[PDB]
Design a protein around this ligand. Sequence first.
Ligand code: 0JO
Ligand code: BR
Ligand code: CL
Ligand code: CL
Ligand code: CL
Ligand code: CL
Ligand code: CL
Ligand code: CS
Ligand code: CS
Ligand code: CS
Lengths: 394, 253
Amino acid sequence: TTLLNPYFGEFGGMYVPQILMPALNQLEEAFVSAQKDPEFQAQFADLLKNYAGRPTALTKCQNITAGTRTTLYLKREDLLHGGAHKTNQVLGQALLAKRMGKSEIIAETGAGAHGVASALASALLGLKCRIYMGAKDVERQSPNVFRMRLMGAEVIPVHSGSATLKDACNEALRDWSGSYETAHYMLGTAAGPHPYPTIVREFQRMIGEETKAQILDKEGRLPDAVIACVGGGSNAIGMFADFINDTSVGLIGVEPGGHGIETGEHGAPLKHGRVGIYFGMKAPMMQTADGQIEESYSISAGLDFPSVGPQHAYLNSIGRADYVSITDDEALEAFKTLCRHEGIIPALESSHALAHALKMMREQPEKEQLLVVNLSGRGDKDIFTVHDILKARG
Amino acid sequence: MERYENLFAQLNDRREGAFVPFVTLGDPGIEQSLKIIDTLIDAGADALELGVPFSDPLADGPTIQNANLRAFAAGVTPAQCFEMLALIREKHPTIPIGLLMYANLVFNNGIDAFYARCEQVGVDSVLVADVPVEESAPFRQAALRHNIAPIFICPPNADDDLLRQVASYGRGYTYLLLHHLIEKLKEYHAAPALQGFGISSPEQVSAAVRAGAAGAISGSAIVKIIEKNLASPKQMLAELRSFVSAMKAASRA
Ligand SMILES: C=C(/N=C/c1c(COP(=O)(O)O)cnc(C)c1O)C(=O)O
Ligand SMILES: [Br-]
Ligand SMILES: [Cl-]
Ligand SMILES: [Cl-]
Ligand SMILES: [Cl-]
Ligand SMILES: [Cl-]
Ligand SMILES: [Cl-]
Ligand SMILES: [Cs+]
Ligand SMILES: [Cs+]
Ligand SMILES: [Cs+]
């Protein structure tokens, strides 16, 4: 029994061991209560504004669209405190934990952006935070790891299974089942069991709400399309949510194509996987023919996840949103182009979104189109990675 | 078939608790696994719970995580597990065999088809570790259509609504994890309760039966014994037999 619908059509649900259901029901009730509480909303708004720095800019990119009929804006989540959109919903989830009287935080991270956001929020709000990241991720990401620890967080390397984001996800669920009385699990994307896909969307939806107000102010109409990269789905659903009922606005999600879809080394389960049940949800998965969860791949650590949030699977199935992929090489070109022509260093995750917008423009340069790319993060974390590639490539 | 009902009737007639060990199929390899399982039976296991290796066993602790890794390291696939199950049943016609599954392996090629294969090979029950009662309808329905008992966990944080659903929905036995739980399950005519919470000593089996449960499942202790004896195939089977005998003796009183 739940207060809200755990499914988006066929996708979603609460596929957890029985012991975790009370934790999920408790969280749902606290969220429903908080959403009707003006005091909670005011506290959340205060932190977003005065701590994280919202609203974020909407930047018009003139140089990169010169000589075409594309007008391109970037929604500047790269300017949020912490350097990525992950901060928005960690602040909300940390307040929910406090509402519930919890004193501890568990979080998973792959890239480290969600982990750093979880640790910063925990430091600000007086929560004891432990981060699962998993050996392979911990072995690299020493910068983000040190920031996490430099903010008082416990970073726990997971050596279970492949020793990556999915196992990080696994060990987080493992820990929470025993600790949920004291600890809140601060899931980092719009995926997992209900009510997380719903909570994460609602605590990211100011991205799209601001974008709508800003485009209206600057252009006097809605965008033709808003474009975002899709790992688990949080930045994209945060940009999309407030435009879902504006049927003229295209919603384009960009999954990582890695070395190329045909290679099988990608992270695009929405369009190239098949529906499975894992991490508490029924959703598109990359999986072996036998139903083992496959390993994904992307140059960008933040998109390297073999599933996707269920609301994206739903919006795709009904034709409301369209999903595409961008390869490592396309994302790297977009990264270089934005640095050189606009003076903004984008995260490699966000570079996938930009690459697809550049394709929309280049393929049809006399098509009139007003596009917004969600620039979900800054690319300082990726400078060493891009350096080593361009040095290896020549 | 009625393997569980027949077992519980025999045990009720002998004033006896069930003892049920868990092992991961193909741990540490197929042939050694088949011999391990034969040793458990010969040593007095009343029923078996058998895990199929899965890439991401999110409901398992470290003991069983590594059991899965050992199995994958030996190349074990669900299809090979189903071959093993047919061989086990061909050898042992009456012992109840339950699987511990993850949802994706059941859903992968169609839920109905999964439970049809279970029926074909002679499995008696399926516990899907990451399907709570709330999501269980297609699994329960498919199980019952193929004469497979769907097994549910009654956790220590269970409430009355949950107790009624578990009682109504489960068959074969109820996987426990208090007097309240046990008597209430009985009040709602639930499948006989097996205590499965950290069962590692003979005395815990005798405590479970005394509490009013129908017996006890040792969810990780067997795997521990495999773990500790990987270089000694001989001692492994030897310590396995000594353990199961002691646990099973504890269930006679
Ligand atoms: C997976 C992580 N980051 C994901 C990420 C993503 C992909 O996650 P969502 O699909 O939930 O936005 C996009 N952009 C940036 C800057 C990101 O850091 C993480 O930090 O754990
Ligand atoms: Br493919
Ligand atoms: Cl308005
Ligand atoms: Cl459009
Ligand atoms: Cl369309
Ligand atoms: Cl037999
Ligand atoms: Cl279990
Ligand atoms: Cs232009
Ligand atoms: Cs993905
Ligand atoms: Cs029953």
